[PDB]
Design a protein around this ligand. Structure first.
Ligand code: AKG
Ligand code: MN
Length: 350
């Protein structure tokens, strides 16, 4: 029939219309229903914190190693990005999502109202009619390489959105480079081993918007997933919690102070470092009272080399833990398995 299921609703509009319950395509399926944690732990463990300005020192590099091996992510302080620039990119995000739907839909990622592409305002690809939908919208923009930006999908109001996002992305790219240099040293690989695969590499800004949900126990704001990136640099809502990370089968809340950044490895890095460091599975749970926003800067490698464990980590006593795949096949796997709520990297394990 008419594949209207391929063009899902804007979730912010569902919430504004006043749905009393999540429509059926957003409902989790038992397995995920039993694992939705809405209550905080009351005695959470301290989270790993890394001070970028101290990262040349052995003691700080050790804190990074502990974070990368045991958590897959860390809070980052003293990272050099002006606090007011962080405020501006988030507030201009709020200003965009607060615009009338008529205006926002000019940036829809459903071309002609039906044809899906990644870039734009909407949600991720709907592959099957029985696919579960997340309780969020997102504005997904290619920021890098700068010459490949399509400004027809960048909001023109607020007027400064483009300038502020580009300035913000310049800072997070510098952070990306500093972190990957420290990771190369931890792995005893050439300090520029990852820089070669980042030449003219794609990078994206994912502005997530999680509307309030009348039944936060029945949906996910964004489904459990690991990022497919090399590195993700995440700026979370400073007022509204919801991010959670999986560690040893348990979910725990991730709470960050304003202007602290969250850095996590993606599946590309887990493969390239042969699983010495882990790409963490995370999710966002909704709440019934307030919307939540986040901005994920998603840093991928270029398509010049196949994705595989670094040769310097492999020898006669140290086998590869993941098989080699082209970037095109890796991309299709990350995107396709996300739609099914499955973990693509598991299919690569040897
Ligand atoms: O909203 C968040 O805190 C997480 C976003 C996220 O996981 C992603 O955009 O990949
Ligand atoms: Mn993510």
């Amino acid at each position: 029939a008419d594949e209207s299921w391929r063009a899902p609703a804007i979730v912010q509009e569902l919430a504004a219309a006043g749905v009393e319950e999540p429509p059926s395509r957003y409902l989790l399926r038992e397995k995920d229903r039993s694992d939705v944690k809405l209550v905080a732990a009351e005695l959470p463990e301290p989270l790993p914190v890394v001070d970028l300005s101290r990262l040349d020192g052995a003691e700080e590099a050790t804190k990074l190693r502990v974070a990368l091996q045991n958590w897959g992510f860390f809070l980052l302080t003293n990272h050099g990005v002006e606090a007011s620039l962080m405020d501006s990119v988030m507030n201009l995000s709020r200003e965009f999502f607060n615009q009338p739907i008529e205006r926002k839909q000019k940036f829809s990622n459903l071309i002609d109202g039906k044809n899906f592409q990644i870039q734009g305002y909407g949600t991720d690809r709907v592959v099957t009619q029985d696919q579960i939908l997340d309780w969020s919208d997102r504005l997904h923009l290619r920021v890098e390489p700068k010459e490949e930006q399509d400004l027809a999908f960048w909001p023109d109001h607020p007027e400064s959105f483009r300038d502020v996002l580009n300035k913000y992305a310049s800072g997070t790219k510098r952070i990306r480079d500093d972190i990957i240099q420290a990771m190369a040293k931890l792995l005893e690989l050439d300090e520029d081993y990852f820089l070669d695969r980042l030449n003219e590499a794609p990078a994206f800004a994912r502005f997530n918007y999680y509307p309030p949900c009348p039944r936060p126990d029945l949906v996910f704001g964004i489904r459990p997933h690991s990022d497919g990136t090399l590195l993700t640099i995440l700026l979370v809502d400073k007022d509204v919690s919801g991010l959670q990370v999986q560690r040893d089968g348990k979910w725990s809340n991730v709470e960050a102070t304003p202007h602290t950044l969250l850095i996590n490895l993606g599946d590309t890095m887990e493969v390239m470092c042969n699983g010495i460091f882990r790409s963490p599975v995370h999710r966002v749970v909704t709440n019934a009272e307030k919307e939540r926003i986040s901005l994920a800067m998603l840093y991928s490698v270029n398509d010049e080399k196949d994705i595989e464990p670094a040769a310097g980590l492999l020898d006669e006593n140290r086998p590869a833990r993941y098989r080699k795949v082209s970037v095109e096949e890796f991309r299709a796997g990350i995107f396709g398995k996300f739609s099914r709520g499955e973990r693509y990297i598991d299919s690569l394990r040897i």
